[PDB]
Amino acid sequence: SPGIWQLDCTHLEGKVILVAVHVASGYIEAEVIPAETGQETAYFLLKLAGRWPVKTVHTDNGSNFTSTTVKAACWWAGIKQEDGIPYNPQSQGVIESMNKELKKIIGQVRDQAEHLKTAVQMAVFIHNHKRKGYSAGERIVDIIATDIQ
Amino acid sequence: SPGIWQLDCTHLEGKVILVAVHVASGYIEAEVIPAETGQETAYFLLKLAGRWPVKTVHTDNGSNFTSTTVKAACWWAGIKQEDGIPYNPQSQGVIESMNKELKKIIGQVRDQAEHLKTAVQMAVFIHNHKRKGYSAGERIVDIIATDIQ
Numbered sequence A, B: 001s002p003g004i005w006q007l008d009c010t011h012l013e014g015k016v017i018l019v020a021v022h023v024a025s026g027y028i029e030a031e032v033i034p035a036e037t038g039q040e041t042a043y044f045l046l047k048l049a050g051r052w053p054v055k056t057v058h059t060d061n062g063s064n065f066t067s068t069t070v071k072a073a074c075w076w077a078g079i080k081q082e083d084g085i086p087y088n089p090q091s092q093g094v095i096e097s098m099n100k101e102l103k104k105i106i107g108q109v110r111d112q113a114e115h116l117k118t119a120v121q122m123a124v125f126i127h128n129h130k131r132k133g134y135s136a137g138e139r140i141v142d143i144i145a146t147d148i149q
Ligand SMILES: COc1ccc(CNC(=O)c2ccccc2C[NH2+]Cc2ccc3c(c2C(=O)O)OCO3)cc1
Pocket: A111, A112, A113, A114, A115, A116, A118, A119, B039, B040, B042, B043, B046, B069, B070, B072, B073, B076
């Protein structure tokens, strides 16, 4: 569980927001891309795995599961590439609610930047710092530290 | 100390590599940009602070210290923007040795990607995972977790 991440792709302003969620904590990283490609997804995962100990990634769709480039990135970075089948139906709703939350935050900050990518990074910040009382950022560090110890 | 980061800018292939180093652990994040601007530096810091609890950033030079855009990003993200004056002379050598190490790793991976940004992210991965026996990635998580607790 400490090493399990889930990919998620959502759309806004004719662009794609690619999100990685640390399942156990709700911590996220995200980027804006023109379109979801294996190339972009592969690069995103390479970045993620250099920053956090990513053991397993549940891909967001079958195209990214199939993509040889995504498979190669997962090979390179020592990531177990898995499907994203919601054998637990609650997964679906959690991701959906997260996308709605993220879009809400983006709306709340949208006039504070010209570019969508800037607003998205503001949303990442706000999401990860929000106390629910610990924040997702606090939870991921505690979970991983406990695992190391 | 758990919240202290240092910016560092180095050059390769006619491009700029912007690095943030977590001082206490040696953990890094990095990106390739065409040139160092306040705009790019500001965006980089916004990304960093959404991902880690960045309390203080020692800027890499006077232009980024002066930049109103960098100041505004630091304001937005709750970062104390400071100078990078090496009152401790050892800081200089550590950063310089890090740049040499990073460039060495980039050379070792360079033929595994077309684009420099990809090689840089591979270097980030290798640097953060390298056991010296804990890795920088393990050290940053332990330092921050201890601070939370
Ligand atoms: C991240 O640093 C920040 C600096 C300042 C502010 C406060 N907001 C404004 O001053 C503002 C508000 C509305 C439109 C334009 C602006 C000025 N431009 C902000 C900006 C900076 C760096 C970037 C950007 C943008 C962008 O506008 O998208 O895009 C990629 O790198 C927020 C964040």
